[PDB]
Design a binder for this molecule. Structure first.
Ligand SMILES: O=C(O)c1cccnc1
Lengths: 5, 330
């Protein structure tokens, strides 16, 4: 969910 | 006539002799990485300087620390990047691993090697005599390196010193206030933290140098060997100089001012007055006597001086007898 999901 | 100029006693013309590419951070081009290689895990700290996160590099399954930069000026953001690259590989200097850009908001982000989120502040009031000597020597290694590279940190404080007590490693972090030293330059005096501002910043002497970090280092040492945090606890920038004068004495303060022809703020005259110099032995009680030694007081007295030229340099400090046992153990 936050750079990568 | 104006105030009297000054120059550093060490590493004076390093940046002048360097190619312009070294210290021209405005002309530096940033090579951007891939932000999708990192996944944020938890927040480590906040404040009006950046949002620091702990992330995981999913490429090699290694932990990292990501610092989200604030919408400040690009001029200062390139300076911190250039300083971190010039110092990459130095002793006890934080290593910049990657620089990425937000694909949506275009916000920059710095990626560092993972560090135990234990700053020196949560540990330096609980150290032994040998630990203080050892960690002071490691902090000196980082200061002497960046000074030799023509860079002054200008924000030395326990919160900017990351420590791994188990493996006895130390890293000097937060280079957002760091600046290249050029002779004759007049810098902004509103740098460093209040409890660690040198007298040259308090009397508004803009032509300072590496010796500013040595005063801040002396405040950390006084806070440790005396078990008093902070050692100079002023309620503002003006009172900060008053608390310093209550210890070092006002005689050497006004001699320091007349030497460099510093135009002191007229508001200081109403709050300064006269203070005799208090000896460092007077700060020793039963709870800190085991951390205080004649070598500690002599080393501390040569760091906390009004005259920035009289202070020990980072190189001279390592050769002090205070670190004789630590150097022999290397
Ligand atoms: O440079 C910084 O601000 C920094 C470095 C490591 C970890 N947290 C912050």
């Amino acid at each position: 969910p936050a750079x990568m999901v | 006539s104006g105030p009297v100029p000054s120059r550093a006693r060490v590493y004076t013309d390093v940046n002048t002799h360097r190619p312009r590419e070294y210290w021209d951070y405005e002309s530096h081009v940033v090579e951007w990485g891939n932000q999708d290689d990192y996944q944020l895990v938890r927040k480590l700290g906040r404040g009006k300087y950046s949002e620091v996160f702990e992330a995981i590099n999913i490429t090699n399954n290694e932990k990292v620390v990501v610092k989200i930069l604030k919408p400040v000026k690009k001029k200062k953001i390139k300076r911190e990047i250039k300083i971190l690259e010039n110092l990459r590989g130095g002793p006890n200097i934080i290593t910049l691993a990657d620089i990425v850009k937000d694909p949506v908001s275009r916000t920059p982000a710095l990626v560092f090697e993972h560090v135990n989120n234990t700053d020196f502040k949560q540990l330096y009031q609980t150290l032994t005599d040998y630990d203080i000597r050892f960690y002071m020597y490691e902090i000196l290694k980082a200061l002497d390196y960046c000074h030799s590279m023509g860079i002054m940190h200008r924000d030395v404080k326990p919160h900017n010193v990351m420590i791994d007590h188990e493996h006895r490693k130390l890293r000097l972090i937060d280079w957002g206030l760091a600046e290249f030293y050029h002779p004759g330059q007049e810098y902004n005096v509103r740098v460093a933290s209040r409890y660690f501002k040198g007298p040259e910043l308090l009397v508004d002497y803009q032509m300072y140098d590496y010796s500013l970090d040595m005063w801040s280092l002396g405040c950390m040492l006084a806070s440790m060997i005396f078990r008093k945090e902070p050692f100079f606890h002023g309620h503002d920038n003006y009172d900060q100089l008053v608390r310093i004068a209550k210890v070092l004495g006002t005689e050497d303060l006004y001699d320091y001012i007349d030497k460099y022809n510093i135009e002191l703020d007229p508001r200081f005259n109403d709050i300064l007055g006269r203070h005799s110099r208090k000896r460092w032995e007077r700060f020793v009680h039963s709870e800190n006597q085991h951390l205080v030694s004649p070598e500690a007081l002599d080393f501390l007295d040569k760091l906390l001086r009004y005259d920035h030229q009289s202070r020990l340099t980072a190189r001279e400090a390592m050769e002090h007898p205070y670190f004789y046992t630590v150097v022999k153990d290397q």
